[PDB]
Amino acid sequence: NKLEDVVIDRNLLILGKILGEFGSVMEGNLKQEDGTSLKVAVKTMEFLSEAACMKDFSHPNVIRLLGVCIPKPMVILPFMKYGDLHTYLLYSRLETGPKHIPLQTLLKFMVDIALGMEYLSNRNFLHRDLAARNCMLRDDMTVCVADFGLPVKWIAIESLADRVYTSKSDVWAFGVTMWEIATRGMTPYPGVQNHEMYDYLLHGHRLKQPEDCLDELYEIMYSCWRTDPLDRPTFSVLRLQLEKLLESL
Ligand SMILES: Nc1ncnc2c1ncn2[C@@H]1O[C@H](COP(=O)(O)OP(=O)(O)NP(=O)(O)O)[C@@H](O)[C@H]1O
Numbered sequence: 001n002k003l004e005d006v007v008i009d010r011n012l013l014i015l016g017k018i019l020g021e022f023g024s025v026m027e028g029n030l031k032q033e034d035g036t037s038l039k040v041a042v043k044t045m046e047f048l049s050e051a052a053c054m055k056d057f058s059h060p061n062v063i064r065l066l067g068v069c070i071p072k073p074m075v076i077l078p079f080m081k082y083g084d085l086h087t088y089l090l091y092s093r094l095e096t097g098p099k100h101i102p103l104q105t106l107l108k109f110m111v112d113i114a115l116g117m118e119y120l121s122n123r124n125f126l127h128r129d130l131a132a133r134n135c136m137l138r139d140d141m142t143v144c145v146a147d148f149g150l151p152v153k154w155i156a157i158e159s160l161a162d163r164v165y166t167s168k169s170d171v172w173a174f175g176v177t178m179w180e181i182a183t184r185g186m187t188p189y190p191g192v193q194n195h196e197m198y199d200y201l202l203h204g205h206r207l208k209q210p211e212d213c214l215d216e217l218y219e220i221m222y223s224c225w226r227t228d229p230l231d232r233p234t235f236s237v238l239r240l241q242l243e244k245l246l247e248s249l
């Protein structure tokens with residue numbers, strides 16, 4: 001019963017336009033204890049205990065859950081006016097978009113996500129859906145991890161092979177995300193269809209090194225896709241590797 005804290009009153013929520021189309025995600029206004037209204041995003045879909053757990057997460061690189069409304073469940077998240085990282089990367093290759101993102105900003109995006117994942121990993125919370133599209137830009141342009149908790153080409157081999165999903169599978173997905181950032185938005189594995197992905201990986205193939213990327217960066221990405229999950233580093237290792245790489249630039 002005490003997990004009533006996470007529940008938000010339906011009349012404090014005003015729903016507006018669709019943002020994207022399991023269920024709908026909408027823009028909205030949440031009335032706060034402050035008297036003020038906050039712009040929110042609202043994803044429709046036990047399940048309050050996990051949401052209460054997620055509500056307690058508090059890190060600059062992890063999206064904060066505001067609460068839930070219900071029997072129709074909706075999760076309240078802060079609206080991020082700058083949107084997802086994937087779209088940002090792609091827009092940056094176009095005029096009227098952001099300017100050309102230099103390597104340093106790209107590496108800083110990877111650090112933000114790795115810090116975000118280090119936090120979640122320390123609390124044994126699996127993300128299970130990490131991709132550039134589920135990484136959000138704050139108003140200060142720091143990145144935060146989103147859409148965790150509740151995509152074939154972000155899924156580790158052992159997880160395609162069996163039902164298994166660990167933090168090392170999240171690590172695999174972080175690797176692919178790093179590649180998404182390095183390539184400024186390419187879909188993983190050009191020329192490989194989704195249904196041939198398990199056989200492709202089983203034969204030892206991985207994402208190829210982007211053209212002008214440092215070997216040092218590719219080394220880091222690659223370590224994320226080692227066949228044995230135990231051979232993959234932790235997020236705390238990755239995080240420090242990317243910090244020292246960025247530092248050396
Ligand atoms: N907190 C938020 N603030 C602003 N926009 C958001 C937020 N959360 C999601 N969106 C956007 O709403 C749209 C639909 O969301 P979503 O269902 O997460 O689609 P998606 O990008 O395919 N991610 P997923 O379905 O988790 O793989 C996307 O454009 C999101 O970037």
Ligand SMILES: [Mg+2]
Nearest residue numbers: 133134146147
């Ligand atoms: Mg998403």
